[PDB]
Amino acid sequence: CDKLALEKTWQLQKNERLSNMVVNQLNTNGFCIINNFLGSSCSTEVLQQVLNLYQSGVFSNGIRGDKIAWIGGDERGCEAIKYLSSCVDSLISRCNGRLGNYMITGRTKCMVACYPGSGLGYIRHIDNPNRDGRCVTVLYYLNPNWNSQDCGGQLWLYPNNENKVVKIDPIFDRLLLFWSDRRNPHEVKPAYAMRYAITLWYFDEKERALS
Ligand SMILES: [Mn+2]
């Protein structure tokens, strides 16, 4: 994994396809899935670093059954997490100006999360119900060979809070983006194996000022 500075022309063109897809799918449907976002070698390095963090005891309790650690990217042993964040930042930067009226110039740290099996999940909720500044939620999933029929842990998304449910498996190297506000209630269904993911929330500068 070459942890983005000197990408090839073919990679730039792929990256433009990705951002155009994100813009069109967020604006049209309120969410967007990208399969195989980083590739297996780089995704494996992200997962290895997440497990090392988890084994070191730095996670803390996150209604919700997750354990979390906030990673800015400059921590020892987190260079692959930093690389992930740089890739998502570049993706969002290519979309800014095209995502609603939002002015996206910043984000949270990476929220590394584990639902440690045991039937744990997160009930239906809205990430940003109260104008807290967060406009786009980004999930990066890290679970190899995950069969949700056995492992549970699907994300159930309710676009536009209507009757339709979208059931999303938390599969390795999958990126998911969705509007953080009341347009996208969602729930993490109970997990029966250790379930790992990283979340980044991107801010709308004008709303984030409020808090
Ligand atoms: Mn959520």
Numbering used by the authors: 73 to 75, 78 to 136, 147 to 295
Which of the paper's sentences describe this entry?
In order to investigate the extent to which the structural features proposed to be necessary for oxygen sensing are conserved between HsPHD2 and TaPHD, we attempted to obtain a crystal structure of TaPHD in complex with Mn(II), a non-reactive substitute for Fe(II), using a TaPHD construct (aa 64-300, TaPHD64-300, MW=29.2 kDa) lacking the N-terminal MYND domain, which could be produced efficiently in Escherichia coli. The shorter construct (TaPHD64-300) yielded crystals that diffracted to 1.2 Å resolution. The substrate-bound and unbound forms of TaPHD crystallized in the P1 and P21 space groups, respectively, reflecting different packing, possibly relating to structural changes in TaPHD induced upon substrate binding. In the TaPHD.Mn structure without TaODD, the manganese ion is octahedrally coordinated by a conserved triad of residues (H209TaPHD, D211TaPHD, and H270TaPHD), an acetate ion, and two water molecules. Deep within the 2OG binding pocket an additional acetate ion forms a salt bridge with R279TaPHD, apparently mimicking 2OG C5 carboxylate binding. Clear differences between the TaPHD.Mn and TaPHD. TaODD structures manifest in the mobile “β2/β3-finger-loop”,32–34 which is disordered in the substrate-unbound TaPHD structure (missing residues Q137TaPHD-R146TaPHD). By contrast, the β7(VI)/β8(V)-loop residue N245TaPHD is not observed in the TaPHD.TaODD structure, unlike in the substrate-unbound TaPHD.Mn structure, in which the electron density of the complete β7(VI)/β8(V)-loop is apparent.
